Design a protein around this nucleic acid. Structure first.
Lengths: 86, 79
RNA sequence: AUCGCUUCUCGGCCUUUUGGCUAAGAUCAAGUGUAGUAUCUGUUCUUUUAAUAUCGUCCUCUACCGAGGACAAUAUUAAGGAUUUUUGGAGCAGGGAGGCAUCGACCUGGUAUUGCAGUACCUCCAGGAACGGUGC
RNA sequence: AGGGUUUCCUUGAUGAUGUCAUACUUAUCCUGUCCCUU
């Protein structure tokens, strides 16, 4: 019916999980049939997705920037934070 | 509630004059002067926006009815 | 009683009102089905292929201009699953242990090559690896 | 012979309210036409 399930989360900050187990967090700006994704201001995490880990929240973080991810290698997505206003 | 209407302005001053006359009270973010394009001159008034409301307040107290222009000005929220 | 204002009844004006004629001018009747118009109710836009039609150059004719032909893609519509998008070619599969196999530079000595090139690598002889990668 | 102060912004202009369906009355459409009980 609605097709909205992806379009809803568009412009939002999104936590995307890759098939190797990486975590890509960026601004979800576009998708397609294959679920190839366009992620603005995107960083990569490896060790953790923090839920306020008292030791530290961030280890092996890398700044990537503007990322196009191929859908083949995507597993899943959740909402990480609201859209930046800019 | 950041934009003010400032009327009763003496005729000669431009945005540079206004910046110089009001900066002693605090930093300014914007200065608008409505123009009449047929004459190319302003209409006698302008709006000056301060960074801080406290500074805008001090300016009202010391500049209303002030010297050089030598006349009383009107200041209020523009809208 | 008289003068004035206001209810209420009534009389007179009310043709101010029926603006011709002929054979009373003549005659005396309906149902169904479709199409069009109007009104009311409910809900939508902006910011690849098929069919049809027809500025540049060359040639010819006539007096730079005009006409005729040929050549170079363009426009519209649809996607009810058949290669460039929306009815899928993807899927599933990694821990085990605290020596073994294979390859590659590599480090020491010594030794050879003196030629005009676009490159898995590049002499050889002996010694050395508490070296690096991968798999179990 | 003599003198003085209050503007919401502020153009040279190639998409907006519709559309569809149903119900009620003709310059069209066809008529010369009928039922029902003892």
């Amino acid at each position: 019916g609605k097709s909205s399930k992806m379009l809803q989360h568009i412009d939002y900050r999104m936590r995307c999980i890759l098939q190797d187990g990486r975590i890509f967090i960026g601004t979800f700006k576009a998708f397609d049939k294959h679920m190839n994704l366009i992620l603005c201001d995107c960083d990569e995490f490896r060790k953790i997705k923090p839920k306020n880990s008292k030791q530290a929240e961030r280890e092996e973080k890398r700044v990537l920037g503007l990322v196009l991810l191929r859908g083949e290698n995507l597993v899943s997505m959740t909402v990480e934070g609201p859209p930046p206003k800019d | 509630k950041r934009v003010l209407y400032v009327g009763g302005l003496a005729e000669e001053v431009d945005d540079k004059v206004l910046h110089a006359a009001f900066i002693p009270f605090g930093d300014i973010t914007d200065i608008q002067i409505p123009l009449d394009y047929e004459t190319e001159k302003h209409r006698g008034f302008a709006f000056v926006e301060f960074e801080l409301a406290e500074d805008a307040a001090a300016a009202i107290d010391n500049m209303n009815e002030s010297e050089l222009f030598g006349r009383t000005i009107r200041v209020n929220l523009a809208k």
